[PDB]
């Protein structure tokens, strides 16, 4: 009977770094997507495998809300079948994804003069992530032929890279807050339904 906690996801003061992307499980609640539909300020709102207009009338077993910050020209990677640093090493959606991706410019919240060094992405990895895999490890990356033995130095790099968001950057380089809603269509009873 309780409303789903979308406000805690969308309106959180800080979001996660994309390598350490945050997942809220949305369960046993009424999901009111009206405040999402009413906003004119989302730069991206795109669904996959679902009609995007009927969310207030649909029932799902569970909904997962994943959220993080990336830069604007990387939002294209938050979709099935993409490649690049984010899709390969940070947040991977499966090829037959069912859900919606919402994003908005967050330059006013996540940039600062001199640089915001709190938002990170994984720059180096030995293999691509599997869909919905999360890698928060900080093992030293061997870029050369000689092993690192856990020590940074020449040819041995910390795997995470700071975005350094600054508000005077071009829009493609500004931070964007992303929420990915994954819709679960199992055969168990529905526990997340819209108001109608």
């Amino acid at each position: 009977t309780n409303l789903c906690p979308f406000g805690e996801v969308f309106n959180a003061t800080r979001f996660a770094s994309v390598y350490a992307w945050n997942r809220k499980r949305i369960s046993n609640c009424v999901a009111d997507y009206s405040v999402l539909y009413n906003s004119a300020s989302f730069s991206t709102f795109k669904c996959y495998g679902v009609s995007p207009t009927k969310l207030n009338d649909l029932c799902f077993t569970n909904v997962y809300a994943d959220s993080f910050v990336i830069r604007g020209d990387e939002v294209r990677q938050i979709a099935p079948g993409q490649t690049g640093k984010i899709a390969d090493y940070n947040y991977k959606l499966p090829d037959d994804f069912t859900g919606c991706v919402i994003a908005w410019n967050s330059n006013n919240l996540d940039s600062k003069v001199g640089g915001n060094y709190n938002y990170l992405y994984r720059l180096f990895r030995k293999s691509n992530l599997k869909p919905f895999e999360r890698d928060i490890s900080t093992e030293i990356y061997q870029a050369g032929s000689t092993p690192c033995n856990g020590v940074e130095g020449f040819n041995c790099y910390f795997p995470l890279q700071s975005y350094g968001f600054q508000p005077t950057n071009g829009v493609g380089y500004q931070p964007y807050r992303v929420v990915v809603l994954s819709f679960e269509l199992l055969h168990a009873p529905a526990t997340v339904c819209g108001p109608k």
Partner: single-chain antibody
Amino acid sequence: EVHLVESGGGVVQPGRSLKLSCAASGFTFSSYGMHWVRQAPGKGLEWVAVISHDGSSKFYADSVKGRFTISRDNSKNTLYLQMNSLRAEDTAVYYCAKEFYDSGNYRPELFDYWGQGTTITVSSEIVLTQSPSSLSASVGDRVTITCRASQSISSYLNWYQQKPGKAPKLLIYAASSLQSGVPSRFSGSGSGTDFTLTISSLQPEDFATYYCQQSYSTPPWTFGQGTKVEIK
């Protein structure tokens, strides 16, 4: 018995405003989402806007965002498109289209029935590619039309027939399901990025332009560029 009648078109200068209307009958109007789709002279189909059955959800093509407003009055069974700040590349025939599934169905949506359109002249995403662009064949022949998607669209690929001068007609939905009233010679196959429409024995009334369109990732709903079929 579904009927859709657009009106409100005309010739206007750039920067002017124009309201289109679509009067619906023959179905329960308040149970269905509705779309506007347009077609510039000599060009293909371009999705414009969508509104949910109660008006609470609305999406727009990027080219019209901030200038067009989609609206509905379910008590009058009428759909509207308020077009402001009009401009030369808004010139097109505008069609209203009824959605295919009911309001509680999760499935990717598509264009069940279309009105005949109203014309506007303004005075002085997943990409689908079809092959071939045009072909000539004889009555009785097999015709094969391919549609490739830039990105996997699973099964959500639909086919429309557009006779010259007419509103488009849904032929196939969900890659291979036949729309009611469509003759058995039309069939569709494929999945992922690779789809085929086949007409097994071409008939005289089959000369038309055939369009694929994907419903997997929306908005925007997107269309192939069209395949023109002629009867020699």
